[PDB]
Amino acid sequence: EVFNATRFASVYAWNRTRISNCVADYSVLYNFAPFFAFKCYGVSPTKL
Amino acid sequence: NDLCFTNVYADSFVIKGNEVSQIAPGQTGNIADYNYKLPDDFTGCVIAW
Numbered sequence: 695e696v697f698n699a700t701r702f703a704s705v706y707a708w709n710r711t712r713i714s715n716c717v718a719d720y721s722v723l724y725n726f727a728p729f730f731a732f733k734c735y736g737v738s739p740t741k742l
Numbered sequence: 743n744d745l746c747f748t749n750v751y752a753d754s755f756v757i758k759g760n761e762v763s764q765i766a767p768g769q770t771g772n773i774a775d776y777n778y779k780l781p782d783d784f785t786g787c788v789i790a791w
């Protein structure tokens with residue numbers, strides 16, 4: 695519901711959701727996303 | 743012109759304009775991840791014309 699949305703706001707108002715109390719399987723991160731830039735800085739995407 | 747190399751590999755492939763900037767040691771993208779990944783401790787040159 696952060697990736698199935700329809701009105702990702704403009705950058706001047708960067709919508710900020712909070713994700714807590716959950717199991718983060720980033721395979722659903724990959725599925726809604728024909729990626730062009732997955733640049734991770736603090737962590738490696740493979741070990742997420 | 744003042745160096746001696748044990749062996750030299752010439753990998754050749756035609757790619758799109760942004761993908762030229764893509765090809766480098768330690769990069770990301772659809773090409774640098776699934777098509778051609780230059781190793782991090784690369785010792786060589788890239789040529790794009």
Ligand SMILES: *[C@@H]1O[C@H](CO)[C@@H](O[C@@H]2O[C@H](CO)[C@@H](O)[C@H](O)[C@@H]2O)[C@H](O)[C@H]1NC(C)=O
Nearest residue numbers: 695696698699700701702703708709710711
């Ligand atoms: C950022 O956009 C998200 C998706 O549109 C919002 O999450 C949802 O918002 C709807 C209301 O539009 C809620 O009913 C739903 O429970 C869920 O929270 C999110 O609120 C929004 N955040 C901000 C700060 O605008």
Ligand SMILES: *[C@@H]1O[C@H](CO)[C@@H](O)[C@H](O)[C@H]1NC(C)=O
Nearest residue numbers: 695696697698699725726727
């Ligand atoms: C958005 O939700 C619809 C619901 O049917 C789904 O079909 C679609 O694939 C989703 N798209 C994205 C980008 O999440």
